[PDB]
Structure formats: structure tokens, C-alpha cells
Design a protein around this ligand. Structure first.
Ligand SMILES: [Cl-]
Ligand SMILES: [Cl-]
Ligand SMILES: [Co+2]
Ligand SMILES: [Co+2]
Ligand SMILES: [Co+2]
Ligand SMILES: [Co+2]
Ligand SMILES: [Co+2]
Lengths: 143, 141
């Protein structure tokens, strides 16, 4: 039942879009909670944190259907069935970000006259290269 | 002014990718946990904290640059605006997005997936109502 093949369906696309939205909702609500914290609204901060746990549960349930339905990781288009595949998906996305995505973002920010944003993107490119290397060391261990 | 720039769009896409990376790594950590790889689980959780810091810094530049929430295209400068953003996205999800995903899943022969989407529609309605009660408290002082 939950093992039915979802490949080629609109439902497959909808699970991907739901995962994206849920992922953003958790991040948004935790960020909003920091503002409630500063301003002295602990009940609102607590509600934001509790609802954020709900959006974790939603995002993880979307990933369960993606994996059980034979779909790929929404971020990388790589299989994530096994732990080894999960680490290979982590490596693929980190490698895209440090080789291509953040360096390109930093070049654009400098060109448009945002050097402070460009320095941030350059920091992140170096950070994602470190992440890729740490994950590569783990994959070598598992294999 | 970041408004209308390519850099605005790059901060939005960076926020999306970072948001997904933290969720992905915490999900992967659960499989490491089950299988008895606590060093791998620990690394995934520590790197996930990295990706929180990346996402939040992207939101810092977005807010400071007068750009809108990546998810809702609503301003997020003040706490009231943040709660209004929360309400807008929850409302979209329960009134349109998850009902529509549930109908497509039923029509394509995936009743279990459709039931999950219907559960989530009802959940996001409850979220919207709780955030609406917060907004009333803030707006009414
Ligand atoms: Cl409060
Ligand atoms: Cl381990
Ligand atoms: Co089943
Ligand atoms: Co949700
Ligand atoms: Co990373
Ligand atoms: Co990152
Ligand atoms: Co919600």
C-alpha cells in the first residue's frame, strides 16, 4: 500500500513541493521565535517552537512517502533508500553548493554592489566544502 | 536596495536549499540512530546546526534588505508581520494546497498519500487558528 510506485505522477511532484514548504516553515517559525524571545513573548515563542515540531513531522512524513514510493531526494534527485545513499545525497548537494552555487552567488553579489552579502556567500561556499569532506570521510568508513 | 536584484533571488533560493538540508540531515540521522552509527548521527546533527545558521543568516539579509518571506512573499520585519506571514502560509496550505494535493492523490490511485494530505490540511487549519489568536493578542496590545 505505502510501497506503491509513485514515479511519473503529479503526486510525486506534490510530495516534493510539500517537503520544500514544510522545510521552510520549520526554519521560518524558529527564526520568528528568536524575535518573540528578544521582545519578551515567551508564550508566542513557545507556540512557534511547538508548531515548528509539527512541520518537522510533516516534512519527515513526506520523505517517508518519497522513499517508500521509489522517488529521489527533493534537494539532489539522488536515491535515499539506504544510509549509504543518504550520505551520497548529502555529498552531492554539498558539492553543488561549494563548486557552483555559493561561488556564483558571491560573484553576482559583488557585481551588483553587495560586498557584505558576497562575503557571506564566500563563507558559506567554504563551509559546504568542509561539510562535503566530512561526509566523504564517513562514506569511506561505511563502504 | 536588494529589491529587484539577482542577489534577492539568490538569498531566496539559498534559504530554500538550506531549509531542506537541515530537514534532510536530521531525517538521515534517524537512520544512523537505528543502525548504530552514533558518530555519523552526531556529524549529521552538528552539520544540520550549520545549515540552521546558514538559513537564518539568509533571512537576516532578506529582512535587513526589505525583502519578503521566501515562503509567502509577505514582509517579516516586525513580530506582527512574522505572525501575519505564518497565518498567510498556513491559510494557503489548508484552504488550497493540501486539499488539492489530496484530490490529485485520490484521482491517481494513492489513497494512503491522500489521507496523509487530508491530515495535514486539518493540521495547518489548527496552526492558522492558533496564530490568528496570537495576532489578536499583539494587534489588540
Ligand atoms: Cl507571551
Ligand atoms: Cl558511527
Ligand atoms: Co503499504
Ligand atoms: Co506543515
Ligand atoms: Co552544508
Ligand atoms: Co548550508
Ligand atoms: Co503549519
Amino acid at each position: 500500500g505505502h510501497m506503491k510506485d509513485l514515479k511519473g505522477t503529479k503526486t510525486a511532484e506534490n510530495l516534493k513541493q510539500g517537503f520544500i514548504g514544510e522545510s521552510m516553515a520549520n526554519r521560518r517559525y524558529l527564526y520568528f521565535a528568536k524575535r518573540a524571545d528578544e521582545e519578551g513573548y515567551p508564550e508566542i515563542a513557545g507556540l512557534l517552537r511547538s508548531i515548528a515540531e509539527g512541520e518537522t513531522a510533516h516534512a519527515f512524513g513526506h520523505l517517508d512517502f518519497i522513499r517508500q514510493g521509489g522517488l529521489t531526494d527533493p534537494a539532489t534527485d539522488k536515491p535515499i533508500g539506504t544510509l549509504e545513499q543518504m550520505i551520497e545525497s548529502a555529498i552531492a548537494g554539498e558539492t553543488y553548493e561549494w563548486t557552483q552555487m555559493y561561488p556564483g552567488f558571491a560573484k553576482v553579489a559583488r557585481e551588483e554592489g553587495f560586498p557584505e552579502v558576497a562575503e557571506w556567500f564566500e563563507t558559506l561556499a567554504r563551509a559546504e566544502k568542509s561539510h562535503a569532506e566530512k561526509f566523504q570521510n564517513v562514506l569511506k568508513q561505511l563502504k
